[PDB]
Structure 1
Amino acid sequence: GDAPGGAHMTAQTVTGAVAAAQLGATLPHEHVIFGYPGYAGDVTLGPFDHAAALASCTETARALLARGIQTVVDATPNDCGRNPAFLREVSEATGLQILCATGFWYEGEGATTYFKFRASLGDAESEIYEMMRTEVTEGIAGTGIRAGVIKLASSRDAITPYEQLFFRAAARVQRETGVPIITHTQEGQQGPQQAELLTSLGADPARIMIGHMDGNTDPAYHRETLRHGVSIAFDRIGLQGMVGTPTDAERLSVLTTLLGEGYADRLLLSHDSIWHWLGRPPAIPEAALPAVKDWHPLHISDDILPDLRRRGITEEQVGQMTVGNPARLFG
């Protein structure tokens, strides 16, 4: 139907280029490793145990491959512990394909001081544009590993001025390279605003995925976002009751409504899971356990797809969301 249009480069994963056809079933928004900004200051008591992280992550990678998932899109922002080299180790040890991102997190929780300062002194937009373009076309930190997607993120009440610098820089790189863009929306807001802003800057709706859209349970919100021609992702499936998130039952209710309205070609599914935390491992209070019980990457494969099928969603619809959509969006 609506095919990417303009410049384009084959999907770049951490181990190199992959043809769209080789992407297979894909989880479009996950984190192999992740650290909240500040975690590096807790290095003495919260060091990265490389052997342990590698063992644990390759184990999860093998479990995903067992479910037929061939690709994961790692959406970790540059300021949240992003590590392309580690991702490459995990991919070379298991065969699982992994795309990594280029971008900064939203103003509310990102490491914003640096670029705010940069912007106080000059054209921060162009500096961000140069970073993004170099990371997508040449490589990250001199490793030769390129980013396969641009990550953008906005706050709840507005796409702030700080956030807009990244959106503008991304639109420029998108027009020039065709690279896909995936986003974070905070607490179920700004989905429509992100779609309008990006398309208004000349970014291709067929290479845009508005994320955390499962954060809103009013389908009018999703239909309005979809009116822009962009794809939307219910990418925190399994995270129930944390950071304003709804329950999976509520997500599936909205999802089946949209599927029944013919939107399968614009819907994607992920967990936004963290396979290994940076800093000191999080101690989950007893009472927060059910919120995170199904928040792991085998949840959609084992619980959601079956539940969708038993509700009347077809094998074609599941294949469209999990294989066809990723192939066109990232390939």
Structure 2
Amino acid sequence: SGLVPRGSHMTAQTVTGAVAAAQLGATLPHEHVIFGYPGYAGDVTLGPFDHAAALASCTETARALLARGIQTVVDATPNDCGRNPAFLREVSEATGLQILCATGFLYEGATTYFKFRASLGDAESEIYEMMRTEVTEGIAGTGIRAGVIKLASSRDAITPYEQLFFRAAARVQRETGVPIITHTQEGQQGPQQAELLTSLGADPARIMIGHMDGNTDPAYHRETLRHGVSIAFDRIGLQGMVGTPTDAERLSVLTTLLGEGYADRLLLSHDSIWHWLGRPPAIPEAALPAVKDWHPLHISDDILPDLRRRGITEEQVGQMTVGNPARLFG
């Protein structure tokens, strides 16, 4: 036990169907099989999607993950960032790797559709309708259901526009028990997000505040944790990428939190992109070190062994990688 999920639950849904909490295994709570920044579709002429090569590439990464003992990936790709459940299902059915997809949108400057629905009507209820339908019935008539709601906020505040999504999410959460994972911008708003969602009636045991590794002051992480929610160092491997701290700094914070007993509330991920949508990313020369360990095998090969040699126990490692994911999503 400890802090178990409240009332209203629905068996964890993956792109290939419902899976039991115990079948989840080691999990990466925040990754992107395919991803495109909003607008990517507008570059379809020179940046078309090569299905054959994306499939070949993604299943390969999937296989490398299974070999590491990772049995599940939570794909956090927002509805406006290329989210494609049917494709994810292909990858999963081809490899056996389990994948949960999300429902939600990126922050304010991403797109403009709902900012517009909001000027003309009740956008909260429209977002609520969409989230609930995708979480209980499916996405785009495919029958594939989202297994997490994804929320995002800006750096300086959770804007009134962003809050429409947080309330729609809170509602669906209370009604269905579906988990909620978030994006925080540049290490800010973690506590505000936690305060808001719990105040809205969302179960702190089904809430994971993301990109918390974006902040290096542990007092900041401790304040979020006070709310009873889990937090994720989900961008491990992306170092100094205009903003992000280094892994050295992330681990310093993690080991402090771990030695303070917060293991039941810490999750680990990379926030990697296996295949980019649109025109392949032009990576400058100086950016190389920053993205060097920014691939999904980094935690399994570098992070988990580094934590262990630091005194973190095998049980603490299993709690973060298997224990937490099973309660959060299962």
After superposition, what is the alpha-carbon deviation per residue over 1:27-62, rounded to whole angstroms, capped at 9, x for unaligned? Answer: 000000000011100000000000000000000000
After superposition, what is the alpha-carbon deviation per residue over 1:173-211, rounded to whole angstroms, capped at 9, x for unaligned? Answer: 000000000000000000000000000000000000000
Instruction: Give secondary structure in 2 for the equivalent of 1:286.
Output: coil
**Alpha-carbon distance in 1 for matches of 2:110, 2:117:** 13
Q: How does 1:14-33 map to 2 (within 5 A)?
A: 14-33=15-34
Instruction: Give secondary structure in 1 for the equivalent of 2:194.
Output: helix
After superposition, what is the alpha-carbon deviation per residue over 1:81-116, rounded to whole angstroms, capped at 9, x for unaligned? Answer: 00000000000000000000000001xx65431101
**Alpha-carbon distance in 2 for matches of 1:203, 1:19:** 22
Instruction: Give secondary structure in 1 for the equivalent of 2:161.
Output: helix
Q: Percent identity?
A: 98
Q: Is the 8 A contact 2:148 2:179 kept in 1?
A: yes
- What is the aligned partner in structure 2 of residue 142 from structure 1? 141
Gaps of 5+ in 2: none
Task: Please identify runs of 4+ aligned residues in structure 1 that moved more than 2 A.
Answer: 109-112
**Alpha-carbon distance in 2 for matches of 1:211, 1:295:** 17
Instruction: Give secondary structure in 1 for the equivalent of 2:307.
Output: helix
Is residue 171 from structure 1 mapped to residue 137 from structure 2 by the alignment?
no
**Alpha-carbon distance in 2 for matches of 1:9, 1:163:** 26
Q: How does 1:4-153 map to 2 (within 5 A)?
A: 4-106=5-107, 111-153=110-152
**Alpha-carbon distance in 2 for matches of 1:23, 1:243:** 34
**Alpha-carbon distance in 2 for matches of 1:153, 1:50:** 28
- What is the aligned partner in structure 2 of residue 159 from structure 1? 158
- What is the aligned partner in structure 1 of residue 243 from structure 2? 244
- What is the aligned partner in structure 1 of residue 225 from structure 2? 226
- What is the aligned partner in structure 2 of residue 315 from structure 1? 314
Q: Is the 8 A contact 2:38 2:111 kept in 1?
A: no
Let me know the Cα RMSD of the aligned residues.
0.6
Q: Is the 8 A contact 1:156 1:189 kept in 2?
A: yes
**Alpha-carbon distance in 2 for matches of 1:206, 1:240:** 29
**Alpha-carbon distance in 2 for matches of 1:51, 1:220:** 47
Q: Is the 8 A contact 2:139 2:146 kept in 1?
A: yes
After superposition, what is the alpha-carbon deviation per residue over 1:270-290, rounded to whole angstroms, capped at 9, x for unaligned? Answer: 000000000000011111000
After superposition, what is the alpha-carbon deviation per residue over 1:131-177, rounded to whole angstroms, capped at 9, x for unaligned? Answer: 00000000000000000000000000000111000000000000000
**Alpha-carbon distance in 2 for matches of 1:178, 1:243:** 36
Q: Is the 8 A contact 2:149 2:178 kept in 1?
A: yes
Q: CA distance change for structure 1 residues 162 and 243 in 2, over 3 Å: closer, same or farther? A: farther
Aligned-pair distance for 1:243?
Answer: 3.7
Given the two structures, how large is their TM-score scaled by the length of structure 1?
0.99
Q: Is the 8 A contact 2:207 2:229 kept in 1?
A: yes
Q: Is the 8 A contact 2:73 2:100 kept in 1?
A: yes
